[PDB]
Design a protein around this ligand. Sequence first.
Ligand SMILES: *C(=N\C)/C(CCCN(CC1CCCCC1)S(=O)(=O)c1ccc(S(=O)(=O)N(Cc2ccc(Cl)cc2)C2CCCC2)cc1)=C(/C)O
Length: 150
Amino acid sequence: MSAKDERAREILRGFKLNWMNLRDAETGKILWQGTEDLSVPGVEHEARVPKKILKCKAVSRELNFSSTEQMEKFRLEQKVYFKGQCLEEWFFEFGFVIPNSTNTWQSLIEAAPESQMMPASVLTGNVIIETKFFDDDLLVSTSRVRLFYV
Ligand SMILES: *C(=N\C)/C(CCCN(CC1CCCCC1)S(=O)(=O)c1ccc(S(=O)(=O)N(Cc2ccc(Cl)cc2)C2CCCC2)cc1)=C(/C)O
């Protein structure tokens, strides 16, 4: 192992996702909320979202996290797979994280204008979100969530 592998593990160790929610960006209405740390790697998490989320033009996510470790450029890469095929890739930057801080991170997730959504009934249980946590180019964790539309 290198210093960077050790550092990634230290960050993971100090990290906790405390709560999260999703809102319709246009109306502000709450679609989903949870307190399960979906960032925990090595386990396939599940989440149930209302099927009307697929009609939204944009979704606002609020994500609350704690970190014992300082981070220079905290960021996420998320890949949206349907039956193993990547259909969307999202990138979000938080930036600098104070050691032993708790932070609320708001992001906007926008519908790709190129594409049209398959129906909820087709998508449900066949969508995996793969999320990669980075400090800059240091990969901290990789986690998966399987989505159901209800
Ligand atoms: C392809 N389209 C070409 C699709 C569409 C499904 C993707 N999402 C649709 C909405 C995206 C923005 C515009 C409005 C439509 S989705 O509703 O299925 C959706 C919404 C939110 C998220 S998530 O915020 O990434 N997230 C998963 C998550 C995991 C780990 C962390 Cl750390 C944070 C967040 C939430 C999902 C429910 C729990 C949390 C993902 C997908 C497809 C499927 O191919």
